[PDB]
């Protein structure tokens, strides 16, 4: 209570070791992309916070422009400088349009982070579909190696098969 020739099992040890090393390489490629994508997405997230902070600054400017303007709009109206009212207001229109450019650039980044978030998820998935094969090949490689060790196969022949 508890199989073939040595040379046939040893060939299969070599084949399974070659397949384990190759699946390993694939996993390490995906993991490098996983790491890189993780870092990139966090950089994009902090850059979005940076847009938000810049947009926030610009809206303080608008509030400031509106409060601060009044007196000098009303002063130049009584004093006949509708021309100086006109400069202040045109200057403010230029401020507003520049805000819309920055908002548009923020939106492009959010859209790119949406794609790269999906990319991250697909990498994680590809990785999780490899792990069963990678682990199964590691175990088979070891079971063959132990079978040969039990049968008394010397270390030198084992090394030839492991590459």
């Amino acid at each position: 209570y508890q199989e073939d020739n040595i040379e046939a099992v040893g060939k299969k040890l070599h084949e399974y070791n070659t397949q384990f090393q190759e699946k390993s390489r694939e996993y390490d490629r995906l993991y490098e992309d996983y790491t890189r994508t993780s870092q990139e997405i966090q950089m994009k997230r902090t850059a979005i916070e940076a847009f938000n902070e810049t947009i926030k600054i610009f809206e303080e400017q608008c509030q400031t422009q509106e409060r601060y303007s009044k007196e000098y709009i009303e002063k130049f109206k009584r004093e006949g400088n509708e021309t100086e009212i006109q400069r202040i207001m045109h200057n403010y229109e230029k401020l507003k349009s520049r805000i819309s450019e920055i908002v548009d650039s923020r939106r492009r980044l959010e859209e790119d982070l949406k794609k790269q978030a999906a990319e991250y998820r697909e990498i994680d998935k590809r990785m999780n579909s490899i792990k069963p094969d990678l682990i199964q090949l590691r175990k088979t490689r070891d079971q063959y190696l132990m079978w040969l060790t039990q049968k008394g196969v010397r270390q030198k022949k084992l090394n030839e098969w492991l590459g």
Binding site: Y27, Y31, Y34, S38, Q39, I41, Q42, R45, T46, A47, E49, A50, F51, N52, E53, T54, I57, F58, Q61, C62, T64, Q65, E66, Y68, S69, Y72, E84, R87, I88, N91, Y92, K94, L95, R98, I102, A117, Y120, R121, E122, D124, K125, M127, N128, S129, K131, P132, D133, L134, I135, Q136, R138, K139
Partner: protein, 925 residues
């Protein structure tokens, strides 16, 4: 182009937009703004330019008040070219330092606030206070104290008449004269004063200190002169020391530049698994959640599993997982650990992800209510365990995209419950010849269950007679029973102080309890700064095993960083170089912030260094990108033109070296700068001051080499402590960033390959003509022995002529330690061509060869005596996740190579046989 269009927001609400040069400093930009603002509405209401400070959004997404207006806009690096004028006044010192810290640590301080985490908030408040207090205390103390803080003595591990050149600060003329090798530095200062007064005359010698010319290295204190590293080095080389007398004021100028117990709750621990989210798995498979309770690496009870639900993104379970342990028995550091597994339906299981949670929080409260544990992906490792209890308790910071599990700890009492206080633990914790003989042999090493119960019974005997066995006793304690825990902690609190070596073992993941780590640190407080420096890298990696942010080890490292600027220098870089690693970003960021608040001076040194490093990164990326397209000579010239740009040249010049902050990297020797032909195209950057070189590598992880070099350094120190100077070259290597670091250039050196174009012996003759050759050959012999033994013990193979180098002194040294611990046994190796030099070019010179064999054997013998030190240090380095130092088999390599399981006589007999076999092997190859 140079020019960039910049948005200006004036405080009147007016907006201007115009092109400025990227090189222009903010002061120049402010002048151009003012000149343009006068032709725009509402100018008359602005105060002068000097009443305002520019504000920008910086790369870390924080608003930054730009006080230094000599900074160039390219250096500032605003997120968008948007400068807002804002009132100058406020607490401008705090604003400046807050903003510098964010840029220096590579993480916005706002990212800590955004978390809305009280533990973080309490860490920052408490630690920043304590560091600021220490920094303010430091300022009060005398110039002596400050000199010791900033420039601690560089001493050898540790009579002839040789001469020294002495000068004064701001004086062309020098004074050459002899003093004793064994004279204390006071006596040199007193002499130069008399030499000054004799040739106008007159003040005391204790008003002064001695500086090494062109270095921040200073000679003071009660030690003799030969014990200083500059003097020892000079004396051995035959060169005359060049010193400067610096007055005390000149050093001050640098300084001024409720009613429910936990033990009443006798019902099982349990959790509600609710849902997972953002799972990405094979649709055909089914999902399962394995859960287990842990203390360190031991299970508190048997693991319990959820049911199989079909794979989807948002799987729902809604199960009560009940564990075989009552709430009253949970230890303080009890760890709830999860692994999400995809499995083929019941009719290789994929480990998807894992997450750990402390069951009590940082204030000793048993957690209640919901938690969202953002998970880390499981990596398929060799020892394929279900759960990952050694993993960090911190949540994955990629909350946007990472998988998560929702759980709920049920409310167990009406009022909140704490882990009992120390007083109530010591309350509960109180209370033959054959078994004494059986305890003895048991403490001479995996203990089995029958032995565990014996040690437990005779725990009082272990404390009385075997205090060095504390670690064994802590592992035999049953941490899933609050009575046994109570009894172990009782003993622990009256346990005698253990030596450093023992303390180091107690810092490992096996000993999570907060009382143990506190006892360990309490034993590490004996450390001198020089010894602590030897272990700094390991103490830092051990922070990744901590459960809470506010811990004893962190406080200890900050204390020592605040008292010694060199320790703080290297603490900063060991932390900074991992700020890209998401499992430690938060913890290291918090330590770095607190460190910075206690050291605003060094912060200025660190800022200058981080900028040099940033220029080099960009410079190295250009060189990589050019190498693929164009040949080397052209690429080399294009590197130089990029370097001579004002903003490059300034940021690359006049900094303290990160490799050694006492070394000043003054003027960049641009024509001598180049890049090496290796795969990552590392930069060779030469300097001249009062010649030094650095190598900037980006693309490789340099941590292996640093560890290897740290250990060779340690070996050299251990050898030198027994009076054996093996003339090693344990040069600087320092990870600075994401796969980035610096390597010290060893001057006047060349590769064995280059010299071999016998030739080795001639080279030495041509570099040491006539009567200097016996020195050179003896330097070669001593260093060949040391590196033969070092590389054998550490298991460093692939030792070839491209990665072995020779100094013109004769000293031989190894480089490029990418591989160690046999990553088969690496035999002890002698090289025939090295034997030929050792034998003075002769076939058979037994006298010399026997001396070399002696040097090898005494070297090996000394390491064996400190074998436990190397095992402990390597054991703690497993925290670093180096692929070649991941398991106890890696540690076994060191046990075998140092032959610790054998007596000294047996070990040395085996070393001899291996030595002899290597001499036999030498000829054959």
């Amino acid at each position: 182009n140079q020019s960039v269009v910049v948005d200006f927001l004036l405080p009147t609400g007016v907006y201007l937009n115009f092109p400025v040069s990227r090189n222009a400093n903010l002061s120049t930009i402010k002048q151009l703004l003012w000149h343009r603002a006068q032709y725009e509405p509402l100018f008359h209401m602005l105060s002068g330019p000097e009443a305002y400070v520019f504000t920008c959004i910086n790369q870390t997404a924080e608003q930054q008040e730009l006080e230094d207006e000599q900074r160039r806009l390219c250096d500032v690096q605003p997120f968008l070219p948007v400068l807002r004028l804002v009132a100058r006044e406020g607490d401008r010192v705090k604003k400046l330092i807050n903003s510098q810290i964010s840029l220096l640590i590579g993480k916005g301080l706002h990212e800590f606030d955004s978390l809305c985490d009280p533990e973080v908030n309490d860490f920052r408040a408490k630690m920043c206070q304590f560091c600021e207090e220490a920094a303010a205390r430091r300022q009060q103390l005398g110039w002596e104290a400050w000199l010791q803080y900033s420039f601690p003595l560089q001493l050898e591990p540790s009579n002839r008449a040789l001469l020294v050149n002495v000068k004064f600060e701001g004086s062309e003329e020098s004074f050459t004269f002899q003093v004793s090798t064994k004279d204390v530095p006071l006596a040199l200062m007193a002499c130069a004063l008399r030499k000054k007064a004799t040739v106008r005359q007159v003040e005391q010698p204790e008003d002064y200190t001695l500086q090494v010319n062109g270095r921040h290295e200073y000679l003071y204190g009660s030690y003799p002169l030969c014990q200083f590293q500059y003097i020892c080095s000079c004396l051995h080389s035959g060169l005359t020391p060049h010193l400067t007398m610096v007055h005390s004021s000149s050093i001050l100028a640098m300084r001024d530049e409720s009613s429910v117990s936990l033990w009443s709750l006798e019902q099982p621990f349990r959790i509600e698994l609710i849902q997972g989210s953002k799972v990405n798995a094979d649709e055909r498979m089914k999902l399962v959640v394995q859960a287990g309770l842990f203390h360190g690496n031991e299970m508190l009870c048997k693991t319990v599993s959820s049911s199989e639900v079909s794979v989807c993104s948002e799987p729902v379970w809604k199960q009560r997982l009940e564990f075989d342990i009552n709430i009253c028995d949970l230890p303080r550091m009890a760890r709830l650990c999860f692994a999400l597994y995809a499995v083929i339906e019941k009719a290789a299981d994929c480990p998807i992800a894992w997450a750990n949670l402390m069951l009590f929080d940082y204030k000793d409260q048993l957690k209640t209510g919901e938690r969202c544990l953002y998970m880390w992906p499981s990596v398929p490792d060799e020892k394929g365990e279900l759960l990952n209890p050694t993993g960090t308790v911190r949540s994955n910071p990629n909350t946007d995209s990472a998988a998560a599990l929702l759980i709920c700890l049920p409310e167990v009492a009406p009022h909140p419950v704490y882990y009992p206080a120390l007083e109530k633990i010591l309350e509960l914790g109180r209370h033959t010849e054959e078994e004494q003989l059986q305890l003895r042999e048991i403490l001479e090493g995996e203990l089995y269950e029958h032995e565990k119960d014996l040690v437990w019974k005779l725990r009082h005997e272990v404390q009385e007679h075997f205090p060095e066995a504390l670690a064994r006793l802590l592992l035999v304690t049953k941490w899933n029973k609050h009575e046994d825990v109570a009894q172990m902690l009782y003993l622990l609190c009256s346990w005698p102080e253990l030596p450093v070596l023992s303390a180091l073992e107690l810092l490992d993941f096996s000993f999570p309890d907060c009382h143990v780590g506190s006892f360990a640190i309490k034993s590490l407080r004996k450390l001198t700064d020089d010894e602590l420096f030897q272990y700094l890298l390991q103490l830092v990696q051990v922070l990744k095993y901590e459960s809470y942010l506010d811990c004893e080890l962190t406080k200890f490292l900050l204390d020592r960083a605040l008292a010694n600027r060199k320790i703080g220098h290297f603490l900063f870089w060991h932390l900074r170089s991992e700020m890209h690693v998401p499992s430690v970003a938060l913890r290291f960021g918090l330590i770095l912030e607190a460190y910075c608040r206690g050291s605003t001076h060094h912060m200025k040194v660190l800022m200058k260094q981080g900028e040099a490093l940033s220029k080099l990164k960009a410079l190295n990326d250009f060189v990589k990108l050019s190498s693929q397209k164009t040949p080397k000579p052209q690429t080399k010239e294009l590197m130089h033109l990029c370097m001579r740009q004002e903003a490059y040249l300034e940021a690359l010049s006049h900094l303290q070296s990160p490799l050694d902050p006492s070394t000043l990297l003054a003027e960049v020797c641009v024509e001598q700068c180049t890049f090496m032909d290796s795969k990552m195209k590392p930069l060779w950057i030469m300097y001249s001051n009062e010649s030094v070189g650095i190598i900037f590598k980006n693309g490789d992880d340099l941590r292996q080499d640093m560890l290897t070099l740290q250990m060779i350094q340690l070996m050299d120190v251990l050898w030198k402590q027994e009076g054996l100077d093996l003339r090693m070259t344990p040069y600087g290597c320092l990870p600075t960033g994401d796969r980035t670091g610096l390597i010290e250039v060893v001057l006047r050196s060349d590769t064995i390959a280059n010299i071999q174009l016998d030739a080795l012996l001639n080279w030495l003759k041509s570099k040491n003509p006539g009567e200097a050759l016996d020195r050179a050959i003896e330097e070669f012999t001593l260093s060949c022995a040391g590196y033969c033994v070092a590389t054998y013990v550490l298991g460093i193979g692939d030792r070839h002529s491209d990665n072995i180098m020779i100094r013109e002194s004769g000293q031989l040294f190894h480089i490029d330690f990418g591989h160690f611990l046999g990553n088969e046994r690496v035999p002890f190796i002698l090289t025939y061509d090295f034997v030929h030099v050792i034998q003075q070019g002769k076939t058979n010179n037994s006298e010399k060869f026997e001396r070399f064999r002696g040097y090898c054997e005494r070297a090996y013998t000394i390491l064996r005596r400190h074998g436990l030190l190397f095992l402990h240090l390597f054991a703690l380095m497993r925290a670093a996740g180096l692929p070649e130092l991941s398991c106890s088999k890696d540690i076994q390599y060191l046990k075998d190579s140092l032959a610790l399981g054998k007596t000294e006589e047996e070990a040395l007999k085996h070393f001899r046989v291996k030595f002899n076999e290597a001499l036999r092997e030498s000829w054959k190859t």
